Amino acid sequence: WTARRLVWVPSELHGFEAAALRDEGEEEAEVELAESGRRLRLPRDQIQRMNPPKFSKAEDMAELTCLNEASVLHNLRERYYSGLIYTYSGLFCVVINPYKQLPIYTEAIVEMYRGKKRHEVPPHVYAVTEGAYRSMLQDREDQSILCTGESGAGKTENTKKVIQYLAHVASSGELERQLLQANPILEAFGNAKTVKNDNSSRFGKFIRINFDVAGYIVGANIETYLLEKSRAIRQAKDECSFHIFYQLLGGAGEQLKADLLLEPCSHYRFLTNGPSSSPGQERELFQETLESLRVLGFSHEEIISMLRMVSAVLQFGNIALKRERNTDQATMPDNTAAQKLCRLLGLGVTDFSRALLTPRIKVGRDYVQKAQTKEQADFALEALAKATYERLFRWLVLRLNRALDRSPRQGASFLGILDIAGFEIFQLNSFEQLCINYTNEKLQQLFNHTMFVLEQEEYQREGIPWTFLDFGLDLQPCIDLIERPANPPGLLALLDEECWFPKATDKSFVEKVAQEQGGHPKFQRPRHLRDQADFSVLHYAGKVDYKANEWLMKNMDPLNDNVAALLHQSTDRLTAEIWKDRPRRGMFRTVGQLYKESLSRLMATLSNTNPSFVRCIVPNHEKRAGKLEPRLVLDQLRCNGVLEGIRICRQGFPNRILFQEFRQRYEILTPNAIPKGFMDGKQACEKMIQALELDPNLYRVGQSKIFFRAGVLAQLEEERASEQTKSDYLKRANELV
Amino acid sequence: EEEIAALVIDNGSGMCKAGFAGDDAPRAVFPSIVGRPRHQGVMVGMGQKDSYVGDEAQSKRGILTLKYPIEHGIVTNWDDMEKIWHHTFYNELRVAPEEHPVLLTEAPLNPKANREKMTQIMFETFNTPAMYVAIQAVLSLYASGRTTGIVMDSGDGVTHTVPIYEGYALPHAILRLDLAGRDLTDYLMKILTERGYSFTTTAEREIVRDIKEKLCYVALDFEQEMATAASSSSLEKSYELPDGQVITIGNERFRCPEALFQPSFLGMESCGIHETTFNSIMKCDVDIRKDLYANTVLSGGTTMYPGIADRMQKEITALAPSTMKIKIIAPPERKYSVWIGGSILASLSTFQQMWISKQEYDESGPSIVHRKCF
Ligand SMILES: Nc1ncnc2c1ncn2[C@@H]1O[C@H](COP(=O)(O)OP(=O)(O)O)[C@@H](O)[C@H]1O
Ligand SMILES: [Mg+2]
Whether residue A411 contacts residue A509, with contact meaning beta carbons closer than 8 Å, is answered with no
DSSP labels for A117-143? -TTTS---HHHHHHHHHHHHHHH-S-E
Chain A CA closest to residue B95: A529
Half-sphere exposure (CA, 13 Å, Cβ side) for A138? Answer: 9
CA distances from B372 to A122, B358, B369 (A): 78, 13, 6
CB contact set of A300 (below 8 Å; sequence gap of 6+)? A294
Mutual angle of helices A374-403 and A178-190, in 10-degree steps: 180
CA distances from A15 to A33, A41, A253 (A): 13, 17, 50
Whether residue A680 contacts residue A440, with contact meaning beta carbons closer than 8 Å, is answered with no
The angle at the Cα of B177, spanning B172 to B183, to the nearest 5 degrees, equals 165
User: From CA A650, how far away is CA A503, in angstroms rounded?
Assistant: 50
Burial of A582 per CB tally in 10 Å (0-12, 13-18, 19+): exposed
Q: CA torsion sign, A654 to A44 to A73 to A647?
A: positive
Q: Does B172 touch chain A (CB under 8 A)?
A: no
CA distances from A157 to A97, A198, A574 (A): 11, 17, 32
What is the number of residues in chain A? 737
Q: CA torsion sign, B91 to B97 to B100 to B104?
A: positive
Q: Do B90 and A528 touch (CB under 8 A)?
A: yes
Q: In the A/B pair of chains, how many CB contacts fall below 8 A?
A: 16
Residue nearest to atom 6 of ligand 1 (CA): B213
Q: Chain B neighbours among A 447-506 (CB < 8 Å)?
A: 497-498, 501, 504
Neighbours of A725 (CB within 10 A): 13
Beta strand B246-249 with B237-240 is antiparallel
Give me the domains of chain B, ranges plus CATH numbers. 1-136+338-374 (3.30.420.40), 137-178+272-337 (3.30.420.40), 179-271 (3.90.640.10)
Instruction: Spell out which residues of chain A touch residue B43, defining contact as CB-CB under 8 Å.
Output: 501
What is the number of residues in chain B? 374
Long-range contacts, stretch B46-51, CB < 8 angstroms, 24+ apart = B48/A515, B49/A511, B51/B83
Closest C-alpha among A532, A537, A530, A581 to residue A559: A581
Instruction: Spell out which residues of chain A touch residue B94, defining contact as CB-CB under 8 Å.
Output: 529-530
Residues of A with a known catalytic role: 151-152, 156, 197, 200-201, 422, 424
DSSP labels for A262-306? ---GGG-SSSTTSS----SS-SHHHHHHHHHHHHHT--HHHHHHH
Distance B17 CA to ligand 2 centre (A): 9
User: From CA A383, how far away is CA A567, in angstroms rounded?
Assistant: 14
User: From CA A83, how far away is CA A77, in angstroms rounded?
Assistant: 10
Whether residue B50 contacts residue B34, with contact meaning beta carbons closer than 8 Å, is answered with no
Q: Does B44 touch chain A (CB under 8 A)?
A: yes
Whether residue A509 contacts residue A518, with contact meaning beta carbons closer than 8 Å, is answered with no
Closest C-alpha among A473, A416, A422, A441 to residue A612: A416
Q: Which ligand is nearest to the CA of B301?
A: 1
DSSP labels for A669-732? G-TTTS-S---SSHHHHHHHHHHTT--GGGEEE-SSEEEE-TTHHHHHHHHHHHHHHHHHHHHH
Q: Chain A neighbours among B 95-154 (CB < 8 Å)?
A: 95-96
Which helix (H) or strand (E) element contains residue B278? helix B273-283
Query: Rounded to 5 degrees, what are φ and ψ at B288?
Result: -75, -25
CA distances from A424 to A231, A305, A469, A621 (A): 15, 35, 28, 17
CA distances from B205 to B62, B75, B185, B259 (A): 11, 20, 7, 18
SS3 label, residue A462? helix
Ligand 1: nearest atom to the Cα of B73: 22
Burial A117-126, CB ≥16 within 10 A → b, else e: ebeebebbbb
Q: CA torsion sign, A417 to A423 to A424 to A430?
A: positive
SS3 label, residue A6? strand
Widest CA span in chain A: 111
Q: How far is CA A476 from the centre of its chain?
A: 18
Dihedral, B110, B112, B115, B121 alpha carbons, nearest 10 = -130
Closest C-alpha among A26, A19, A15 to residue A5: A19
Closest C-alpha among A211, A229, A231, A230 to residue A221: A211
Known binding-site positions of A for ATP: 149-156
DSSP labels for B141-196? HHHHT-SSEEEEEE-SS-EEEEEESSS---TTT-EEE---HHHHHHHHHHHHGGGT
SS3 label, residue B267? coil
Neighbours of A70 (CB within 10 A): 26
Q: Which residues pair with B289 in a beta bridge?
A: none
Instruction: Spell out which residues of chain B touch residue A530, defining contact as CB-CB under 8 Å.
Output: 94
User: From CA B48, how far away is CA B39, in angstroms rounded?
Assistant: 12
Whether residue B17 contacts residue B349, with contact meaning beta carbons closer than 8 Å, is answered with no
DSSP labels for A517-536? S-S-TTEE---SS--SSSEE
Say which DSSP state A90 is in: T
Q: How far is CA B24 from the centre of its chain?
A: 18
Closest C-alpha among A221, A206, A217 to residue A133: A217
Q: Chain B neighbours among A 498-517 (CB < 8 Å)?
A: 498, 501, 504, 508, 511-512, 515
Distance B300 CA to ligand 2 centre (A): 5
User: From CA B5, how far away is CA B20, in angstroms rounded?
Assistant: 7
User: From CA A95, how far away is CA A106, in angstroms rounded?
Assistant: 18
Experimental method: cryo-EM
Ligand 1: nearest atom to the Cα of B339: 21
User: From CA B318, how far away is CA B311, in angstroms rounded?
Assistant: 10
